Design a protein around this ligand. Sequence first.
Ligand code: NAD
Ligand code: NAD
Ligand code: NAD
Ligand code: NAD
Lengths: 312, 313, 312, 313
Amino acid sequence: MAMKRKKISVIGAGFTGATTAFLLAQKELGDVVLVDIPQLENPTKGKALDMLEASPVLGFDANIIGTSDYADTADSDIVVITAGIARKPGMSRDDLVTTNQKIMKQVTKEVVKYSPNCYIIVLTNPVDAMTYTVFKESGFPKNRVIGQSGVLDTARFRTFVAEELNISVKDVTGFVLGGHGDDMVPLVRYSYAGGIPLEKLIPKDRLDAIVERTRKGGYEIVNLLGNGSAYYAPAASLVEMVEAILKDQRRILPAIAYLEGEYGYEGIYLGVPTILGGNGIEKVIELELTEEEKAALAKSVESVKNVMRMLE
Amino acid sequence: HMAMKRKKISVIGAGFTGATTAFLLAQKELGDVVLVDIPQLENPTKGKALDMLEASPVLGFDANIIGTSDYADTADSDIVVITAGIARKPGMSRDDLVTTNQKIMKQVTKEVVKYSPNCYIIVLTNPVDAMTYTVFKESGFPKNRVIGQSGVLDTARFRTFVAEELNISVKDVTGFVLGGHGDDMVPLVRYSYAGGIPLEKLIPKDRLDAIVERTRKGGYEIVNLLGNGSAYYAPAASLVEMVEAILKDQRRILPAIAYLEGEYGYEGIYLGVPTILGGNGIEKVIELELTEEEKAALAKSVESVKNVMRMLE
Amino acid sequence: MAMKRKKISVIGAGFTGATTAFLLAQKELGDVVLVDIPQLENPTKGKALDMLEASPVLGFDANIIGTSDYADTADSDIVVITAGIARKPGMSRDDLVTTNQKIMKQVTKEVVKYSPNCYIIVLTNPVDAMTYTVFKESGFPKNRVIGQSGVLDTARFRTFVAEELNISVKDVTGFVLGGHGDDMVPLVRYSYAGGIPLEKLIPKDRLDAIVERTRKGGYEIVNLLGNGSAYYAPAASLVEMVEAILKDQRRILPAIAYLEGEYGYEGIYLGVPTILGGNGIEKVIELELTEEEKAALAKSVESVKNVMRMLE
Amino acid sequence: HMAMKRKKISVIGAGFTGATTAFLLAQKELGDVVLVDIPQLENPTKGKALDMLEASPVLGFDANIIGTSDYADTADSDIVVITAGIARKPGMSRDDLVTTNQKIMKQVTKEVVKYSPNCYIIVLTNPVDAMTYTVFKESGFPKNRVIGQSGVLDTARFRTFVAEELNISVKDVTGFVLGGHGDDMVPLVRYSYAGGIPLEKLIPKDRLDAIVERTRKGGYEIVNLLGNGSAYYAPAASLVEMVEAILKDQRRILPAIAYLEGEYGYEGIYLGVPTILGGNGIEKVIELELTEEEKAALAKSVESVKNVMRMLE
Ligand SMILES: NC(=O)c1ccc[n+]([C@@H]2O[C@H](COP(=O)([O-])OP(=O)(O)OC[C@H]3O[C@@H](n4cnc5c(N)ncnc54)[C@H](O)[C@@H]3O)[C@@H](O)[C@H]2O)c1
Ligand SMILES: NC(=O)c1ccc[n+]([C@@H]2O[C@H](COP(=O)([O-])OP(=O)(O)OC[C@H]3O[C@@H](n4cnc5c(N)ncnc54)[C@H](O)[C@@H]3O)[C@@H](O)[C@H]2O)c1
Ligand SMILES: NC(=O)c1ccc[n+]([C@@H]2O[C@H](COP(=O)([O-])OP(=O)(O)OC[C@H]3O[C@@H](n4cnc5c(N)ncnc54)[C@H](O)[C@@H]3O)[C@@H](O)[C@H]2O)c1
Ligand SMILES: NC(=O)c1ccc[n+]([C@@H]2O[C@H](COP(=O)([O-])OP(=O)(O)OC[C@H]3O[C@@H](n4cnc5c(N)ncnc54)[C@H](O)[C@@H]3O)[C@@H](O)[C@H]2O)c1
């Protein structure tokens, strides 16, 4: 009968989790619980308390707590999972999978104990196999277990196109199927500057360079930082997705969704166009792809099946 | 004829406090942001700035952010926020900390005034009373143009503790802390309310004293939890409010570190005092009628500030 | 939808209603149903549609409809009542109270039929007697029936003081108890610029002229417009009250609340300091008033009862 | 030394569109506002202005808002928005509306360009194409400093209908409408998408044709519902996006009414075209590669506009 705040738990209090927590609180999307392992309890509480102390200056009404106790996550409307080791150049794709999978299983189990009705958004890489792992561990219907990937890649692409044409990023669009890197399947033909196909504004070679920079866009921020991974744009990418769900916006967003025949694939998570709203993933949109695009996506899907085969 | 131009804000020092501020500034479309650090940290600075910029299509702000070690990129900044400085390492004395940071302020200020002769400057670097003073003397600028941050942060921690104690919105809680930062700050409970109701009516004294002491220790509370470095979220927010007040000439009444020429009985010092902050920087130091108890607490604060100023070379 | 958007119905689609609806939508507080009499159905649909067609420009996700059918208000979380008649030429004070009483009872019956669990915020003058009418007709708990006057009166006070001192309205606080007009009790003692008592910044004579201009603030706007009363600041005042409830903010705000011993009064609605949150009025706050502040609030309360004796 | 100061926007015509525009600009703190109307309506204009100001403490915005019939109060405006027009009356001919509004545009611009010789001007007043033309010729400003609004509003109505058809956020629908503000406007479905997907892939042809038509009648639909008056919320919203684009030098791509000097094969007229809008007003007309079908729908639109320009005294 009372009007209660949405409750958002963010698991992993490293740069991306914290940046997320702070953005969610500022936008008054609800109360935030920043979670990490017992050994990291003091810094998690320090970050959460520091964020809460900005509330009177920035003028947002939101609780923020830090914790290592998953009992504090009880009755979360949304949980965002950012726990685990980041993508870096020259890393063993298998080692990544092995350590993070274990983390997704231990986290998912504690999340569903205390919030059995929550919607879950996964950042942890590799995001297809880790979102798959939260899906199967959780026992949730596919509309409640969502992965982030395509929004971040479309943000880097739009940024590079906006700088290339010297126009508002507000009026530039991109469009990606599949995951990060080699797995990325962009549709330049469905990318525009104020409604005009980029393919009529930018020579093919310069467009192919922006696409390739988008593929290595993560590695680009790693190379600059020297001793971490991107966090500003990943966190902003999670917040757009959390907002679409909490405010039932019915956004069309690229997301990592479970396929049961869409694009001709079943039993997998894949970056596809999505409607995102109050029921989480409300539709996977099936485009008419050209023979070439179909081919590039069959290629992304074999990489997906390859990483799922590294799962114990 | 003059085309409409974006405001320009340079943030000197691209660690916790400067990067957090820059992102907030960018999200609020207060203008374009130049994030500046030493040559040795040029690339991490470029990474933070580019990561922030790649957030812009998602969060929906129009703002340029670049990282640089070339101060020439700061040219014609309306506002410069100085977070450049060094933390006190175990085995470094008080005196060597003041001196090291002093020397950073002199070198930073020289470059800032060279490329933006008309900018306003806000200083965070600790020890912030002494370092804001160094920036003032080095800049050659009139006092209205050189402002330190500390009060807004300390009132924010105080308003957080009172909001939690009473279970009410932080929006409806008011504090006032003058003096220095850390141990030296002077929270004034007489000028502190919830919905305009004096706090001494709503919270027993023993609890209110613990809230005052907790405010005083607020910095160390966060240092003790993080196990590397100091607070940045609330510090950054406090700088953003002060930047807003100036760029949008809002004439806020808030505590700022202001150069005194007689106010409260003191001259030739930066001290945390009530301020009108607007399009011309510190427009007024407001002189309150203090009690003997407040005056005595303020004078202890001034002794400590003069102690740190004696360590300057 | 598991994450349902909040639903706000605004009864009365004139100046205050329409301006309240457009602010609510812009702030994404929920979906808005704008309601007027069957005769004004089409202008109501056209105001609603016009605001909705601004949603792509201003960037808000919100439905706005106009209707003369209360079934459209079903399961509203909040109902804002602005329904009211403009006092005709050659109509007594008695018949004005009596005409708006009949409108509040008819409106309330429709409101409870379709949203028996809603919070009601009343603006309709005379706002103490009309809030009282909605409470009694509704059978709701007292925390779920609320009136607006204090916030608007504190807003005018704050504007005048901010003009006098040449400072941000953000750093000026006021406190107005009682009713509107001669009935309203501004407490200059509880009034500050940046926490500084206004009696320290403004000579008695200027502070007195500002208290009188706060008393007359409605009249002032009426006399400038020539046809109609204020709507911008009224609407803004209702939005802050709507926001304190939907986001469970627990503001301390002057609101028209039902008294059961507070200030030594019982069985009336009166402007008092209030904690406003997710349960509506969480408590009425009792200040230590001077002998003198007590006399003015008694003068006010006598004026409120005067109007209540006019209720059929 | 110059202190920081607010941007300054004068709104001419304090009716439905002006007042609504004024209240958005202030809430968003885009600058101080001066609401201008005839002397007969000075007190109602001051009443709106004061009502708005009295909301500022509640909605928490720092802006001055004033009402005036004296153009001296508009001195040194960065942006001037012109909404002034005769109130349409039962039985007023088209001649008398256009002819009267032309006179108003010439009188209003004379005063505007006298007190703000360096301002950017956005024109709403109908018939908007011919009226923007009249402000341009009377101002003696370069074409980049005199901009009309019609396409933002008309693409907003299109996006609204497509969003309702598909049940998706308006944030993810794009459209593009060229030409005039009449039945003659050209909504381009080819350059219109939902999440960058072509609308022809998602909406059947009969439905899409009905949306295009509902876009052409958009203004009329609102007139017919209101009974007395035309739309003002979406119009005010459209002016605000165009003011923001200029004040914050955003370099948006939106449809605006621009002086053509060869673009699309037309010379010496104002027409709704794809614009880059920024700190120097209209920075460029973008020439789309239209189909013969589109060229012809635009050619008609141009014919409708030249017909109005014939009636100009
Ligand atoms: N989807 C994308 O596009 C995208 C982009 C950025 C990075 N990422 C992923 O998101 C994260 C970004 O790095 P970050 O800033 O979050 O890293 P970080 O190391 O700074 O923080 C992650 C946290 O996970 C914690 N953690 C480890 N095991 C845990 C467990 N069992 N339970 C709870 N917490 C545990 C770590 O202790 C650490 O604090 C990584 O997981 C990376 O794989 C993906
Ligand atoms: N006033 C307050 O309320 C308050 C609160 C927060 C922190 N602080 C102070 O703010 C300062 C910064 O805090 P932080 O957490 O950001 O520290 P940090 O080490 O994370 O960031 C400081 C940055 O300054 C840079 N820097 C050093 N010398 C420089 C120079 N010559 N030119 C340019 N950049 C230079 C360093 O390279 C570093 O990246 C400290 O002095 C801290 O004590 C004061
Ligand atoms: N409490 C305050 O601070 C405050 C301030 C301003 C306005 N008010 C009051 O607000 C009320 C409305 O103000 P306004 O300026 O919007 O007036 P208005 O005349 O523009 O609008 C009132 C609307 O109520 C409608 N209405 C009448 N009977 C109705 C019914 N049975 N069902 C539904 N709708 C019905 C009318 O048709 C009209 O559209 C008045 O009572 C006014 O005195 C009080
Ligand atoms: N271009 C578009 O997309 C678009 C959309 C909306 C409306 N319009 C046009 O906008 C104009 C304003 O519409 P509205 O709804 O605000 O009308 P309105 O009649 O409510 O307001 C117009 C105001 O202009 C004032 N005015 C008239 N002559 C003046 C003068 N010489 N100097 C100063 N003020 C003067 C009037 O007093 C009146 O208050 C009309 O011409 C309308 O047709 C065009």
